[PDB]
Amino acid sequence: SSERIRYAKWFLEHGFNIIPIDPESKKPVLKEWQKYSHEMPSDEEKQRFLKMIEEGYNYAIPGGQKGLVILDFESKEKLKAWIGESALEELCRKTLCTNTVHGGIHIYVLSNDIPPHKINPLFEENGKGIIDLQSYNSYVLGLGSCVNHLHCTTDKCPWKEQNYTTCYTLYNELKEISKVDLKSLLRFLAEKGKRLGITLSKTAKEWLEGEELRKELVKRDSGKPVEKIKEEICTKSPPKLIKEIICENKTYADVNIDRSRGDWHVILYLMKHGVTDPDKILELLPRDSKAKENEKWNTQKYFVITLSKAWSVVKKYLEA
Ligand SMILES: [Zn+2]
Numbered sequence: 001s002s003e004r005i006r007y008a009k010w011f012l013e014h015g016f017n018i019i020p021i022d023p024e025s026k027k028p029v030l031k032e033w034q035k036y037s038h039e040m041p042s043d044e045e046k047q048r049f050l051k052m053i054e055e056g057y058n059y060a061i062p063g064g065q066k067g068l069v070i071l072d073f074e075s076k077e078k079l080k081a082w083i084g085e086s087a088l089e090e091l092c093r094k095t096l097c098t099n100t101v102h103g104g105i106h107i108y109v110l111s112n113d114i115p116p117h118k119i120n121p122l123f124e125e126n127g128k129g130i131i132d133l134q135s136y137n138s139y140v141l142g143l144g145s146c147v148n149h150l151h152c153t154t155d156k157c158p159w160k161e162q163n164y165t166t167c168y169t170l171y172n173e174l175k176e177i178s179k180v181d182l183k184s185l186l187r188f189l190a191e192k193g194k195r196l197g198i199t200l201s202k203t204a205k206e207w208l209e210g211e212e213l214r215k216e217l218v219k220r221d222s223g224k225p226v227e228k229i230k231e232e233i234c235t236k237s238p239p240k241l242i243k244e245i246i247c248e249n250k251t252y253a254d255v256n257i258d259r260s261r262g263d264w265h266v267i268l269y270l271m272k273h274g275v276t277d278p279d280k281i282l283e284l285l286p287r288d289s290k291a292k293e294n295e296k297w298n299t300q301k302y303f304v305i306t307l308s309k310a311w312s313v314v315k316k317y318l319e320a
Contacts, residue, residue, distance in 0.1 A: 003167070004144030007174070008053045011142065012046045014176065017065050018142060020049055021058035026151070028139075029057065034320050037064035037136040038313060040241060040265055058145035063118060064136030064313070067110040069182060071122065072140055073131040074156070076105040076171075083192050095178035097171040101147045102156055105171060106140050111182035115207045116309070117316035123189065125198045133204070136313055137320040143168050183208055213308060214278060222274035226283055229275055242269050251286040259290040263306060271314040278307055 011018050017036040020029045029052070030036075053059050063069050073079045076099065080088055091097060096108040118138035121129025134140050141147075146167035149159035186208050190200055200208060211217075224232070234247040241257065244250045245266055252262040263285060270281055282303070285291055291303040 003169075004058065004142075004146070005050075005054050007143035008059045009050060010174065011059075011061060012041070012050060015041060015066065016061060016068070016177075017041050018049055018053075018059045018061055019139060020052040021060050021141065021145065023056065023058050026147075028060065033062070033139070034137045034317055037062040037138070038268055038317070039065075039239065040261075042240065059142040060139035060145075061108075061142050062136075062139040063134040064114065064116075067112060067114055067179070068135075068177065069109060069111065069114050070134040070140045071107040071109070071131055071185075072100070072134050073105045073107070074102075075130065076103060078125075078130060079105055082196055082198055083189070087188075087192070092172050093175075095180070096175055098143050099169045099171055100141075101149075101166040101168060102158065106168070108177045109182065109185070110177055110179040112179075114182060116312035117320070119201070119203050119207065121201050122186075122204045123193060123198050124201050125193075125196065129201070130198065137317060141168050143170065143174075211304070213311070217276040217278055217307065217311060220274075221277035221280065223277055223280075224275075226280055229270075229273070229280065229284070233269075233273060238269070241265055245286055246284060249286075251288045253288050259288060259293070262286075263290055264310065267306060267310040268314060271310055272317070276311065278303070281307070 008018055017039070019033045019036050021027065022029045049059070061068070061070065083091075091107060096106075098106045098108075100106055115133065115135050118133060118135050120132040120138075122131050122133040124130065132138075144167065146165050148163065148165045149157050150161055150163045152160045154160075186200070186204070189198075193199060222229075230246060233242065238246065241255065241262065242265075244255045245252075245262070252259050255262075266285060267281060270276075270284060275281060275284070282289075282291060287293065291299060291306065294302060
């Protein structure tokens with residue numbers, strides 16, 4: 001009750017999107033909840049979701065947004081044995097870690113490099129997943145939300161059909177979700193897991209340890225004239241940033257948004273609209289775009305990397 005609202009407010013205030021979870025159906029209240037893994041918080045939406053949680057809804061934090069992944073370990077006891085108490089305390093000291101309702105642990109981190117979709121499972125032990133990486137198109141239930149195990153069906157619930165309630169709770173204290181080198185954390189987990197037979201799943205390993213693109217971006221383009229694209233978007237009720245940049249011809253500096261963040265969100269929207277041709281994208285970006293306003297050697301690395309990441313994110317999202 002009080003903790004559910006206290007922490008949802010904390011997340012919103014730190015720039016994180018939350019999504020309301022219907023405590024009757026245990027599922028998101030919103031139809032396209034996956035979009036909150038990658039769109040920008042709207043202040044009115046923030047305000048509405050907070051009120052829903054005050055009214056009794058649970059809430060969830062989607063992965064992907066802002067570089068967030070949540071490492072969702074089935075068993076806190078297992079994680080302690082796997083990495084040791086000292087490494088676990090360092091991790092809980094560096095960033096937010098929470099207890100989950102069925103005895104696991106969530107470790108929330110930001111990273112510059114994260115996968116374009118959840119990886120479920122991330123590590124396996126005796127052929128079975130024991131931790132999922134929650135990234136885009138996935139979420140975790142939020143601090144302060146609770147569950148009555150009387151209504152659990154999965155056999156992961158130790159208390160299935162007992163009238164017993166537990167909650168997502170602080171593992172120690174509340175601290176800001178911190179940035180880490182995720183690939184480096186994952187390599188550390190793998191190193192520590194070797195002696196226990198805890199190993200990266202195939203999908204994890206291929207993300208971690210391992211342009212034909214342009215042609216595929218061009219090939220998948222819609223591929224209308226730029227003027228038609230502007231007309232179509234501007235008559236589709238776009239989000240605030242998109243309206244400003246695509247329809248109102250404002251710069252990132254005009255609307256006082258970070259260049260990088262502006263490019264990222266504008267590019268996602270366009271690719272979701274079917275505008276994947278890099279030159280069309282470039283033409284629709286404002287003049288202070290980090291893809292334009294840069295020393296030229298940087299300009300191209302940045303644009304390629306951004307397009308590449310955006311497209312992998314859009315592809316997985318549509319597939320979701
Ligand atoms: Zn349960």
